[PDB]
Design an enzyme around this catalytic site. Structure first.
Site, PDB file in Angstrom:
ATOM      1  N   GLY A  18      -4.143  22.244  -4.852  1.00 30.43           N
ATOM      2  CA  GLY A  18      -4.993  22.949  -5.790  1.00 30.43           C
ATOM      3  C   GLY A  18      -6.348  22.275  -5.752  1.00 30.43           C
ATOM      4  O   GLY A  18      -6.553  21.353  -4.965  1.00 30.43           O
ATOM      5  N   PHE A  22     -13.354  18.969 -10.702  1.00 34.50           N
ATOM      6  CA  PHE A  22     -12.995  17.551 -10.758  1.00 34.50           C
ATOM      7  C   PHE A  22     -12.740  16.985  -9.363  1.00 34.50           C
ATOM      8  O   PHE A  22     -12.762  15.771  -9.156  1.00 34.50           O
ATOM      9  CB  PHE A  22     -11.725  17.362 -11.576  1.00 34.50           C
ATOM     10  CG  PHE A  22     -10.496  17.908 -10.904  1.00 34.50           C
ATOM     11  CD1 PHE A  22     -10.282  19.274 -10.824  1.00 34.50           C
ATOM     12  CD2 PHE A  22      -9.572  17.055 -10.321  1.00 34.50           C
ATOM     13  CE1 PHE A  22      -9.170  19.776 -10.174  1.00 34.50           C
ATOM     14  CE2 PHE A  22      -8.457  17.552  -9.670  1.00 34.50           C
ATOM     15  CZ  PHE A  22      -8.256  18.915  -9.597  1.00 34.50           C
ATOM     16  N   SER A  24     -10.048  17.686  -5.918  1.00 34.15           N
ATOM     17  CA  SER A  24      -8.910  18.426  -5.387  1.00 34.15           C
ATOM     18  C   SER A  24      -7.606  17.651  -5.498  1.00 34.15           C
ATOM     19  O   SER A  24      -7.609  16.428  -5.613  1.00 34.15           O
ATOM     20  CB  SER A  24      -9.144  18.778  -3.921  1.00 34.15           C
ATOM     21  OG  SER A  24      -8.975  17.639  -3.103  1.00 34.15           O
ATOM     22  N   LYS A  39      -4.424  13.420  -6.965  1.00 36.83           N
ATOM     23  CA  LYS A  39      -5.604  13.992  -7.595  1.00 36.83           C
ATOM     24  C   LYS A  39      -6.787  13.110  -7.190  1.00 36.83           C
ATOM     25  O   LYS A  39      -6.945  11.996  -7.692  1.00 36.83           O
ATOM     26  CB  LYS A  39      -5.433  14.004  -9.120  1.00 36.83           C
ATOM     27  CG  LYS A  39      -6.533  14.735  -9.850  1.00 36.83           C
ATOM     28  CD  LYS A  39      -6.351  14.653 -11.349  1.00 36.83           C
ATOM     29  CE  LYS A  39      -7.586  15.146 -12.071  1.00 36.83           C
ATOM     30  NZ  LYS A  39      -7.490  14.914 -13.534  1.00 36.83           N
ATOM     31  N   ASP A 131      -3.318  22.179 -22.691  1.00 33.54           N
ATOM     32  CA  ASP A 131      -3.367  23.137 -21.605  1.00 33.54           C
ATOM     33  C   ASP A 131      -1.998  23.594 -21.101  1.00 33.54           C
ATOM     34  O   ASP A 131      -1.822  23.811 -19.908  1.00 33.54           O
ATOM     35  CB  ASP A 131      -4.197  22.572 -20.446  1.00 33.54           C
ATOM     36  CG  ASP A 131      -5.197  23.575 -19.916  1.00 33.54           C
ATOM     37  OD1 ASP A 131      -5.887  24.194 -20.756  1.00 33.54           O
ATOM     38  OD2 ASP A 131      -5.303  23.745 -18.682  1.00 33.54           O
TER      39      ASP A 131
END
EC number: 2.7.10.2
Length: 282
Positions: A18, A22, A24, A39, A131
């Site tokens: 994804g 910020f 990938s 991340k 979230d």
């Protein structure tokens, strides 16, 4: 702070899971060689963003639950990187699309039940996810789901809520409780609202919430005492549950202690009518 990893034990593949501003998320392995999601902060990052991920890394370290993506550690190398366990299955929503004949409602309720257990845990640890949504629920397999992306997560402490600053960008309105939109107030019961939308997303096999609406078109809807319809073939007990998750008054909305217990019953009821079987988290 023993959470630092040796860059040498991490092999980062040229596979992106994804992305976003910020940076990938990439797949790789960490030393045997466990599969991991990495991340990686954008190359041109700033203190603020490096502090956030660092706080995120810190919050995940405090969480120990089967239904939550685990933090492997942080790695400071050619970039700041959050190394966490891998959930190959991918997002819950993309996973359920066009699979009503492959994944029965009993299986969907299984995954939603697991998510409710993770959130019950989060509530106990007094952490607000903020979230929670189908796109942030990741599957190890079809019978094992994990809550991920604690980027907006925040500790409450003794407080039962908090008012957030407003950062640049847009808010995923269709997943926010009324008090979130009108007063920027967030809490566990706020995650419950998001959990209800998540139930709908999953029980409707990947459909978008309030499809056809947008912005204040959604709030006006909710305000008037209306909500999303019962997804096709969703048992009444399940809908009654997700519906209760959308009770306007914060004070009258169930907490995850109650949602889990109710989701547990709805699940075992369906599951007890299925033929054949699978294993624990497999």
């Amino acid at each position: 702070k023993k959470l630092f990893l040796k860059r040498d034990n991490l092999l980062i593949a040229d596979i992106e899971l994804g992305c976003g501003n910020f940076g990938s998320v990439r797949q790789g392995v960490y030393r045997k060689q466990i599969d991991v999601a990495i991340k990686v902060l954008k190359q041109g990052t700033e203190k603020a963003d490096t502090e956030e991920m660092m706080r995120e890394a810190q919050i995940m370290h405090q969480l120990d639950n089967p239904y939550i993506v685990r933090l492997i550690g942080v790695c400071q190398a050619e970039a700041l990187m959050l190394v966490m366990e891998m959930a190959g299955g991918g997002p819950l929503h993309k996973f359920l699309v066009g699979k009503r004949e492959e994944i029965p409602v009993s299986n969907v309720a299984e995954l939603l039940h697991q998510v409710s257990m993770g959130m019950k845990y989060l509530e106990e640890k007094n952490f607000v996810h903020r979230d929670l949504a189908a796109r942030n629920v990741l599957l190890v397999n079809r019978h094992y789901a994990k809550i991920s992306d604690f980027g907006l997560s925040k500790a409450l402490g003794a407080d039962d809520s908090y008012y957030t600053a407003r950062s640049a960008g847009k808010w995923p309105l269709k997943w926010y409780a009324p008090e979130c939109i009108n007063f920027r107030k967030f809490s566990s019961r706020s995650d419950v609202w998001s959990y209800g939308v998540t139930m709908w997303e999953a029980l409707s096999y990947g459909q978008k919430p309030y499809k056809k609406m947008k912005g204040p078109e959604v709030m006006a809807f909710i305000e008037q005492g209306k909500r999303m319809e019962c997804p096709p073939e969703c048992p009444p007990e399940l809908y009654a549950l997700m519906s209760d998750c959308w009770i306007y008054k914060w004070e009258d909305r169930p907490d995850f202690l109650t949602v889990e217990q109710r989701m547990r019953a709805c699940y075992y009821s369906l599951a007890s009518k299925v033929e054949g079987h699978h294993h624990h988290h497999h």
